Amino acid sequence: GKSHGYRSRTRYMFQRDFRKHGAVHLSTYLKVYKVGDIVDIKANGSIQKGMPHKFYQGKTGVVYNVTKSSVGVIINKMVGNRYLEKRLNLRVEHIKHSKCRQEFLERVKANAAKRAEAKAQGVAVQLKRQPAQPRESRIVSTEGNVPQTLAPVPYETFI
Amino acid sequence: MAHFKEYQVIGRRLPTESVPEPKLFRMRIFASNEVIAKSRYWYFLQKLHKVKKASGEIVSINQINEAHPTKVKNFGVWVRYDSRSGTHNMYKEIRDVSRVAAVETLYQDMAARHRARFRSIHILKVAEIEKTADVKRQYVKQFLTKDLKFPLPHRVQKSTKTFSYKRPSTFY
Amino acid sequence: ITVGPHFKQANNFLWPFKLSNPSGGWGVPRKFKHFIQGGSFGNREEFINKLVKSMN
Amino acid sequence: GIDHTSKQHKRSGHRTAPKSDNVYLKLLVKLYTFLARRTDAPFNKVVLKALFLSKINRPPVSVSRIARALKQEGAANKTVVVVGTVTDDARIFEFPKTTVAALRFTAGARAKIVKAGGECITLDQLAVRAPKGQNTLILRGPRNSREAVRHFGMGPHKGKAPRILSTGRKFERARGRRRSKGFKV
Amino acid sequence: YVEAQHKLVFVVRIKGINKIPPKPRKVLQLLRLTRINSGTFVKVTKATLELLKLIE
Amino acid sequence: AKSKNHTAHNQTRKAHRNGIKKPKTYKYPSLKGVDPKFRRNHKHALHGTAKALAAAKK
RNA sequence: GGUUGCGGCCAUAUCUACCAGAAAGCACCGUUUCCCGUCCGAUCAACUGUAGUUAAGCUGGUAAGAGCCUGACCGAGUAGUGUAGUGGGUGACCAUACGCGAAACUCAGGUGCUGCAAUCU
RNA sequence: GCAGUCAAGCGUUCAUAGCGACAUUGCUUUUUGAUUCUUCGAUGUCGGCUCUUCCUAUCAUACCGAAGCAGAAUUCGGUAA
RNA sequence: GAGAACAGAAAUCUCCAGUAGAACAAAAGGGUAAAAGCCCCCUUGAUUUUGAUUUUCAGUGUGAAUACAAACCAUGAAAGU
RNA sequence: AAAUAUGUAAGAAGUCCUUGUUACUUAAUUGAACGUGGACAUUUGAAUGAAGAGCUUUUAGUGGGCCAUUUUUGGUAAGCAGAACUGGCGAUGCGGGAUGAACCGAACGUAGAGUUAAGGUGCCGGAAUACACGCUCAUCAGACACCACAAAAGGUGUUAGUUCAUCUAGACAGCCGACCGGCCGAAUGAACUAGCCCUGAAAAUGGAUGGCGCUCAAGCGUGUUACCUAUACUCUACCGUCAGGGUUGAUAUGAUGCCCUGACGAGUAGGCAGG
RNA sequence: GGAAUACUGCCAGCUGGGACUGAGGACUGCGACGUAAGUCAAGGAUGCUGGCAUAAUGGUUAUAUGCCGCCCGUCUUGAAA
Lengths: 159, 172, 56, 185, 56, 58
Ligand SMILES: NC[C@@H]1O[C@H](O[C@H]2[C@@H](O)[C@H](O[C@@H]3[C@@H](O)[C@H](N)C[C@H](N)[C@H]3O[C@H]3O[C@H](CO)[C@@H](O)[C@H](O)[C@H]3N)O[C@@H]2CO)[C@H](N)[C@@H](O)[C@@H]1O
Ligand SMILES: NC[C@@H]1O[C@H](O[C@H]2[C@@H](O)[C@H](O[C@@H]3[C@@H](O)[C@H](N)C[C@H](N)[C@H]3O[C@H]3O[C@H](CO)[C@@H](O)[C@H](O)[C@H]3N)O[C@@H]2CO)[C@H](N)[C@@H](O)[C@@H]1O
Ligand SMILES: NC[C@@H]1O[C@H](O[C@H]2[C@@H](O)[C@H](O[C@@H]3[C@@H](O)[C@H](N)C[C@H](N)[C@H]3O[C@H]3O[C@H](CO)[C@@H](O)[C@H](O)[C@H]3N)O[C@@H]2CO)[C@H](N)[C@@H](O)[C@@H]1O
Ligand SMILES: NC[C@@H]1O[C@H](O[C@H]2[C@@H](O)[C@H](O[C@@H]3[C@@H](O)[C@H](N)C[C@H](N)[C@H]3O[C@H]3O[C@H](CO)[C@@H](O)[C@H](O)[C@H]3N)O[C@@H]2CO)[C@H](N)[C@@H](O)[C@@H]1O
Ligand SMILES: NC[C@@H]1O[C@H](O[C@H]2[C@@H](O)[C@H](O[C@@H]3[C@@H](O)[C@H](N)C[C@H](N)[C@H]3O[C@H]3O[C@H](CO)[C@@H](O)[C@H](O)[C@H]3N)O[C@@H]2CO)[C@H](N)[C@@H](O)[C@@H]1O
Ligand SMILES: NC[C@@H]1O[C@H](O[C@H]2[C@@H](O)[C@H](O[C@@H]3[C@@H](O)[C@H](N)C[C@H](N)[C@H]3O[C@H]3O[C@H](CO)[C@@H](O)[C@H](O)[C@H]3N)O[C@@H]2CO)[C@H](N)[C@@H](O)[C@@H]1O
Ligand SMILES: NC[C@@H]1O[C@H](O[C@H]2[C@@H](O)[C@H](O[C@@H]3[C@@H](O)[C@H](N)C[C@H](N)[C@H]3O[C@H]3O[C@H](CO)[C@@H](O)[C@H](O)[C@H]3N)O[C@@H]2CO)[C@H](N)[C@@H](O)[C@@H]1O
Ligand SMILES: [Mg+2]
Ligand SMILES: [Mg+2]
Ligand SMILES: [Mg+2]
Ligand SMILES: [Mg+2]
Ligand SMILES: [Mg+2]
Ligand SMILES: [Mg+2]
Ligand SMILES: [Mg+2]
Ligand SMILES: [Mg+2]
Ligand SMILES: [Mg+2]
Ligand SMILES: [Mg+2]
Ligand SMILES: [Mg+2]
Ligand SMILES: [Mg+2]
Ligand SMILES: [Mg+2]
Ligand SMILES: [Mg+2]
Ligand SMILES: [Mg+2]
Ligand SMILES: [Mg+2]
Ligand SMILES: [Mg+2]
Ligand SMILES: [Mg+2]
Ligand SMILES: [Mg+2]
Ligand SMILES: [Mg+2]
Ligand SMILES: [Mg+2]
Ligand SMILES: [Mg+2]
Ligand SMILES: [Mg+2]
Ligand SMILES: [Mg+2]
Ligand SMILES: [Mg+2]
Ligand SMILES: [Mg+2]
Ligand SMILES: [Mg+2]
Ligand SMILES: [Mg+2]
Ligand SMILES: [Mg+2]
Ligand SMILES: [Mg+2]
Ligand SMILES: [Mg+2]
Ligand SMILES: [Mg+2]
Ligand SMILES: [Mg+2]
Ligand SMILES: [Mg+2]
Ligand SMILES: [Mg+2]
Ligand SMILES: [Mg+2]
Ligand SMILES: [Mg+2]
Ligand SMILES: [Mg+2]
Ligand SMILES: [Mg+2]
Ligand SMILES: [Mg+2]
Ligand SMILES: [Mg+2]
Ligand SMILES: [Mg+2]
Ligand SMILES: [Mg+2]
Ligand SMILES: [Mg+2]
Ligand SMILES: [Mg+2]
Ligand SMILES: [Mg+2]
Ligand SMILES: [Mg+2]
Ligand SMILES: [Mg+2]
Ligand SMILES: [Mg+2]
Ligand SMILES: [Mg+2]
Ligand SMILES: [Mg+2]
Ligand SMILES: [Mg+2]
Ligand SMILES: [Mg+2]
Ligand SMILES: [Mg+2]
Ligand SMILES: [Mg+2]
Ligand SMILES: [Mg+2]
Ligand SMILES: [Mg+2]
Ligand SMILES: [Mg+2]
Ligand SMILES: [Mg+2]
Ligand SMILES: [Mg+2]
Ligand SMILES: [Mg+2]
Ligand SMILES: [Mg+2]
Ligand SMILES: [Mg+2]
Ligand SMILES: [Mg+2]
Ligand SMILES: [Mg+2]
Ligand SMILES: [Mg+2]
Ligand SMILES: [Mg+2]
Ligand SMILES: [Mg+2]
Ligand SMILES: [Mg+2]
Ligand SMILES: [Mg+2]
Ligand SMILES: [Mg+2]
Ligand SMILES: [Mg+2]
Ligand SMILES: [Mg+2]
Ligand SMILES: [Mg+2]
Ligand SMILES: [Mg+2]
Ligand SMILES: [Mg+2]
Ligand SMILES: [Mg+2]
Ligand SMILES: [Mg+2]
Ligand SMILES: [Mg+2]
Ligand SMILES: [Mg+2]
Ligand SMILES: [Mg+2]
Ligand SMILES: [Mg+2]
Ligand SMILES: [Mg+2]
Ligand SMILES: [Mg+2]
Ligand SMILES: [Mg+2]
Ligand SMILES: [Mg+2]
Ligand SMILES: [Mg+2]
Ligand SMILES: [Mg+2]
Ligand SMILES: [Mg+2]
Ligand SMILES: [Mg+2]
Ligand SMILES: [Mg+2]
Ligand SMILES: [Mg+2]
Ligand SMILES: [Mg+2]
Ligand SMILES: [Mg+2]
Ligand SMILES: [Mg+2]
Ligand SMILES: [Mg+2]
Ligand SMILES: [Mg+2]
Ligand SMILES: [Mg+2]
Ligand SMILES: [Mg+2]
Ligand SMILES: [Mg+2]
Ligand SMILES: [Mg+2]
Ligand SMILES: [Mg+2]
Ligand SMILES: [Mg+2]
Ligand SMILES: [Mg+2]
Ligand SMILES: [Mg+2]
Ligand SMILES: [Mg+2]
Ligand SMILES: [Mg+2]
Ligand SMILES: [Mg+2]
Ligand SMILES: [Mg+2]
Ligand SMILES: [Mg+2]
Ligand SMILES: [Mg+2]
Ligand SMILES: [Mg+2]
Ligand SMILES: [Mg+2]
Ligand SMILES: [Mg+2]
Ligand SMILES: [Mg+2]
Ligand SMILES: [Mg+2]
Ligand SMILES: [Mg+2]
Ligand SMILES: [Mg+2]
Ligand SMILES: [Mg+2]
Ligand SMILES: [Mg+2]
Ligand SMILES: [Mg+2]
Ligand SMILES: [Mg+2]
Ligand SMILES: [Mg+2]
Ligand SMILES: [Mg+2]
Ligand SMILES: [Mg+2]
Ligand SMILES: [Mg+2]
Ligand SMILES: [Mg+2]
Ligand SMILES: [Mg+2]
Ligand SMILES: [Mg+2]
Ligand SMILES: [Mg+2]
Ligand SMILES: [Mg+2]
Ligand SMILES: [Mg+2]
Ligand SMILES: [Mg+2]
Description:
part of a larger assembly, 6 chains, D: about 180 residues, alpha/beta, 4-stranded parallel sheet, two-stranded parallel sheet, 5 helices, 8 strands, F: about 60 residues, mainly alpha, 2 helices, about 45% helix, binds paromomycin, binds magnesium ion, RNA-binding, cytoplasm (chain F), ribonucleoprotein (chain F), ribosomal protein (chain F)
């Protein structure tokens, strides 16, 4: 018979890390989650209550609810062809605080402060990001570095 | 790997804030063009130092013409090559008027008697044989003798008309 | 050629170029080996000009 | 050969002229096709499209729906346009004046429109008075009020209504309709 | 003198439209080469540079 | 007799014809599954901030 | 800077040995009426700060120390792996092309950082 | 089922005249399985008799090589269907 | 490991060591060390109400589960659970 | 502890300032949501593409599948059984692989001209009995992916190469008075490696590198050019389909028209349309 | 030391030979040569000459020749079977 129950195949997945076990520290409990927070989901084996199904491990979603010990998180999973809307009630030991968006705020805020530099001066803005570029012409000095010339090495057995 | 050129190919690791001015490295590469030679370069350098082409850059590439191209020379050729069951090293001697012409005939010989395609051959060193009498392989020595004359018997002359009106002769 | 600020829309304005097969062949026996090995199929760098021009 | 990034020889879903044969309807279109082409008026385009609609897409615009729209701030005097038939509604009492340009008006609609001293304009008359359709208020009847649209998308837990012939008890209230018999929906 | 690396590249698709894996197949569409022997210009950047080489 | 058992072959293909859609989001999402005594008190917080504009405008 | 109450991270903080520790604090320690807990005032409780003490707990240093943390074109562009050909090989396997790229090894360095409060030559 | 290779051992002595353990590379499809492609609007199902032809992995016969071939006999092998 | 009348391999008592090498009904895996283990004290949240969510899924049923609300209780100095 | 594959974000539904509501929440004008009024756009906050974006109803067939590369289970194995990803066959002709469901190339309205792919260019057969360096002589040589098999083990056949030993302090063969010497005058001895070929290599009608036949190939390895021709690519004419635009202001004989423009065209089961 | 030459590449450098095509049907466009009158190769072929009615040419049909082409219908993963 085939065996498909809830936590099957999670053996290595829900394991706590080598030399990290026991009680979970207080940074996890001392974190505040309001609605709209974008959180990463990773289960914790020490806490059995209110933990994600193994699917949502690694997924990231926006918390839609805040309750006593848990936060409801709305997540998007695909079934057939579409994404339906899943909402999980998960405890805080299983919730991270996602660094995905965090930098975007530190981007916008730096963008508005560089806007005042075109307001107080009038130079061109260059706000939107541009990907890495072909580089450029340069000159490489032979001074103190003269190219040392290599050949291929023959074949010899090392054992 | 078609009809051959020699290239000085000079390349280096990319410079870092830690280390500006990393060391330049030069290889002489026998290839058919600059795209292969540049690629050929990174092939061996990745067999020598820790560099990718992604991590490095090429500083220069320059063709090297023969200095005395109408002067007959005797060449030593050091070759590493993989064979069907193993990979081994060889010394061969080639007599020609350039290094290119000699590498050109090098790869054919490695194809003809050892079945060695280009990809399985490394050219370790190719240098001119300084004197005579330092020439090892005897198939070169035959043409080193004093006042060397030989015939070319049994002359076969390509025809044009598909029918010919006399029994031909080979007499040269 | 200079790339520059409006290259996105200047290039996008351009319909993709319909070209004939190379006049005088592809130079190789077999196209789908890489340029470095057997010819065509890859970045041939400056050698794209001899090809594209013969496909024009 | 092409690797096609979209489907060949696809036609757009929209109609072109109506499916109806009514020779007068076909004329009003010949009018407003011309209008919408040679004007800047977006109203003519809108009326043109709405002339091809099917009786399910042109639900009756009730007179009370016209009246409440005149109680809109700033639209009070505008001549209202309905590209379909207009119905009488006894449920109101004091109905204002205006003029209403429609395809058809029910007998109660027409006669009661005029009792308040107003005109029933017919769409070409409206076109001549308002070639750019200016100071016009276009009204639409509800198309989701329909019977058939009540049964659409009938799933478990969708709270829709089933196709059903008789109705009462004994009819589809037992197993699956309550926690007491089977499950509920 | 080490030249500036090239900012501009020309890509002509030399393969037919048959039997192509999805991720390359989608890329060739996004570079607007859906037909054999057709070509477009591409601005070289580590964004599009990865669109090449995957299309190689 | 014996026959096939299962496959996923061709299903990615079928699911990419019309497929894969998107979550089709709106502003003002549904409140489904939110604390009752939030959504209870939240009613009266809005019930009251109504009168505030049923006064101010006059 | 030491020291303590509550800490964050939870070995650069652990282990083993051996020394050093002024001031204050911590302890160790005296007490067995009362609340209180045990077979046993050992742990727990209460009284006292008085009778005594750095021996220990504790804090530091020392160790070609264990472990742990860190670095590197150390090994290694090696193992593996993504893409490719009407590449090689009877095969097993293997090379080359465009890319991604380890762990062991080795050399090297480091051995808690720090919050709120209080207190002390 | 048939045959290689290595050669510890057998053969008084002596690996290999003739053999051959441990292993290991194979061929064959007159064995049996494994499979279920063909045929279930039907390919007559055992054996024999009769007759032809093909195979060779040769029982005899022709010519040979080897022997632990004196002769005689035998054995191993080659060209041989 | 080192130690005590009979007391021996095995009885009960002691100290030191001991990251879990034990225990948690059971299959196996995960999880737990001032505990989730051992032991003791008190209790009946194995209760009421009725919705939502996860797995399986057609996003039906069923089984099992998670986070709440509204009561009414247990426990503890309490926060809590 | 990878590679590959995988969830999320990259804005006007944004970032903030203020302070009204409530029965929730707090030591509390603490919060929590939800509002009022207000600050900022120009690269509006990566690339690339968009043949337009969203939405709804209904209904056919199907619900035996199979194949290739790769990852992969059972099995000695199978043209065997069973999974993963993609591509295909089925449902599909075309050029190539002689032959062929699935391979390579390329997918198809009617045509002309050009050029090519995969594959080829002695003759069958369109296209160099082309150029170049070697190798190979087989009393079944060999001849090109899928593919229509051969292995261990041998070869004093021939070819290149490796290692160790001897040799100008004159060796090794040879002639001359084991060893030594004279002349000679540059190699020698052994163990190896892998190319082509040979042995290994036994089946039943007569037979198949596709066929003739090819031996400094018309074979094998390698290089360089010319050339041949697909329903593919480029240019143009024509038929149809879809899309966008103009137009009864007219003066006849069609506004379902007339006219301009761009793209596209495989198809079984099946749907629909125009006939 | 001063060239030459090869090789690769550019010219909005000048010229010779061949092939297929001539869609459209007053004028509207953008141009170029012009001191100008005006001319042009500038939003699709015109000029000239000849040849043909016992007929040139075009359709059909039979035969021949080069290359090609398995029996439809059906079920089937797969049928010329
Ligand atoms: N800025 C002028 C605007 O004009 C508008 O009205 C006029 C037009 O601008 C508008 O024209 C259409 C509009 O109907 C439709 N719903 C949207 C469409 N984009 C508009 O078109 C507009 O944009 C397109 C594209 O850039 C231009 O080609 C066109 O010239 C322009 N008018 O419709 C009206 C004419 O039919 C409004 N009054 C208002 O938004 C504003 O005044
Ligand atoms: N209009 C004509 C009348 O219609 C009647 O039917 C209409 C109603 O009377 C009938 O409702 C039945 C009713 O028959 C019967 N005597 C009482 C019953 N509670 C009603 O049922 C009502 O509640 C049930 C749920 O409990 C709903 O399913 C139903 O739609 C609702 N009408 O449902 C119909 C409306 O939807 C009779 N069937 C018919 O014989 C009579 O002529
Ligand atoms: N047993 C026979 C065969 O063995 C094969 O075994 C192959 C695999 O085990 C392994 O192949 C790996 C492959 O798994 C992985 N996904 C990609 C990688 N490039 C391959 O690598 C291998 O093949 C490439 C081919 O060019 C060689 O360059 C490389 O040296 C070799 N290690 O190496 C073997 C081939 O060298 C296959 N499993 C399969 O074809 C079949 O089972
Ligand atoms: N019988 C009288 C005589 O004896 C003769 O003597 C022969 C026999 O004694 C013996 O022959 C044997 C025979 O016995 C046995 N049954 C068969 C075996 N193959 C034969 O073997 C002999 O003959 C064959 C064939 O000629 C040879 O190939 C073989 O080398 C030989 N030893 O060896 C002699 C031949 O070598 C013959 N039998 C016969 O012709 C002659 O007239
Ligand atoms: N990317 C900016 C966008 O701006 C949008 O804003 C658009 C609308 O919200 C705003 O529309 C206003 C409307 O709010 C208000 N209640 C009525 C007013 N007449 C509209 O105005 C708009 O539409 C009218 C009518 O066509 C035009 O005449 C006028 O030009 C236009 N501003 O006009 C804007 C378009 O001009 C949206 N907020 C959103 O899609 C997005 O943030
Ligand atoms: N509960 C009633 C509500 O209270 C609101 O006020 C409460 C909060 O919303 C308000 O806080 C405001 C906040 O509204 C606004 N959107 C942002 C602002 N920074 C906050 O201010 C807060 O932080 C600052 C320091 O940063 C403190 O000095 C201040 O006391 C504090 N209330 O302070 C109050 C307690 O924290 C408003 N008055 C209003 O919406 C309503 O009356
Ligand atoms: N043109 C015939 C060539 O031989 C190939 O086929 C050859 C093989 O099929 C066959 O080889 C078999 C071997 O399988 C089986 N053991 C039986 C037979 N004794 C062998 O034959 C072989 O004999 C020896 C090697 O043993 C070789 O010298 C000989 O050339 C070869 N025929 O011999 C055929 C003829 O030599 C192909 N037909 C073809 O591709 C190739 O060009
Ligand atoms: Mg199982
Ligand atoms: Mg883990
Ligand atoms: Mg980990
Ligand atoms: Mg529990
Ligand atoms: Mg070049
Ligand atoms: Mg190095
Ligand atoms: Mg050397
Ligand atoms: Mg070796
Ligand atoms: Mg040497
Ligand atoms: Mg040689
Ligand atoms: Mg190699
Ligand atoms: Mg001649
Ligand atoms: Mg002659
Ligand atoms: Mg003659
Ligand atoms: Mg040509
Ligand atoms: Mg070719
Ligand atoms: Mg060729
Ligand atoms: Mg040309
Ligand atoms: Mg051309
Ligand atoms: Mg087409
Ligand atoms: Mg409504
Ligand atoms: Mg409604
Ligand atoms: Mg409901
Ligand atoms: Mg009814
Ligand atoms: Mg019941
Ligand atoms: Mg029940
Ligand atoms: Mg580049
Ligand atoms: Mg582009
Ligand atoms: Mg780049
Ligand atoms: Mg069955
Ligand atoms: Mg089935
Ligand atoms: Mg089953
Ligand atoms: Mg559809
Ligand atoms: Mg005491
Ligand atoms: Mg005490
Ligand atoms: Mg001390
Ligand atoms: Mg240490
Ligand atoms: Mg450090
Ligand atoms: Mg292969
Ligand atoms: Mg690589
Ligand atoms: Mg990546
Ligand atoms: Mg890295
Ligand atoms: Mg320490
Ligand atoms: Mg047999
Ligand atoms: Mg013996
Ligand atoms: Mg003997
Ligand atoms: Mg048997
Ligand atoms: Mg069968
Ligand atoms: Mg059978
Ligand atoms: Mg039959
Ligand atoms: Mg049968
Ligand atoms: Mg019969
Ligand atoms: Mg019969
Ligand atoms: Mg019978
Ligand atoms: Mg039988
Ligand atoms: Mg025989
Ligand atoms: Mg015999
Ligand atoms: Mg017998
Ligand atoms: Mg003997
Ligand atoms: Mg005898
Ligand atoms: Mg006898
Ligand atoms: Mg025998
Ligand atoms: Mg016979
Ligand atoms: Mg222990
Ligand atoms: Mg252990
Ligand atoms: Mg328990
Ligand atoms: Mg267990
Ligand atoms: Mg455990
Ligand atoms: Mg622990
Ligand atoms: Mg409480
Ligand atoms: Mg307030
Ligand atoms: Mg675009
Ligand atoms: Mg359907
Ligand atoms: Mg069905
Ligand atoms: Mg069926
Ligand atoms: Mg099968
Ligand atoms: Mg098969
Ligand atoms: Mg096979
Ligand atoms: Mg089967
Ligand atoms: Mg299978
Ligand atoms: Mg896979
Ligand atoms: Mg395939
Ligand atoms: Mg198909
Ligand atoms: Mg096909
Ligand atoms: Mg064919
Ligand atoms: Mg074949
Ligand atoms: Mg074919
Ligand atoms: Mg391929
Ligand atoms: Mg010919
Ligand atoms: Mg070939
Ligand atoms: Mg073969
Ligand atoms: Mg066979
Ligand atoms: Mg062989
Ligand atoms: Mg061999
Ligand atoms: Mg040999
Ligand atoms: Mg020998
Ligand atoms: Mg030899
Ligand atoms: Mg020497
Ligand atoms: Mg000699
Ligand atoms: Mg030698
Ligand atoms: Mg045979
Ligand atoms: Mg033959
Ligand atoms: Mg052939
Ligand atoms: Mg012959
Ligand atoms: Mg022959
Ligand atoms: Mg031929
Ligand atoms: Mg050759
Ligand atoms: Mg030629
Ligand atoms: Mg055609
Ligand atoms: Mg139109
Ligand atoms: Mg069609
Ligand atoms: Mg189609
Ligand atoms: Mg059809
Ligand atoms: Mg059909
Ligand atoms: Mg018709
Ligand atoms: Mg000079
Ligand atoms: Mg000079
Ligand atoms: Mg030139
Ligand atoms: Mg000129
Ligand atoms: Mg014309
Ligand atoms: Mg003009
Ligand atoms: Mg002029
Ligand atoms: Mg002028
Ligand atoms: Mg003029
Ligand atoms: Mg004339
Ligand atoms: Mg005729
Ligand atoms: Mg035929
Ligand atoms: Mg049938
Ligand atoms: Mg059948
Ligand atoms: Mg069947
Ligand atoms: Mg079928
Ligand atoms: Mg089957
Ligand atoms: Mg059939």
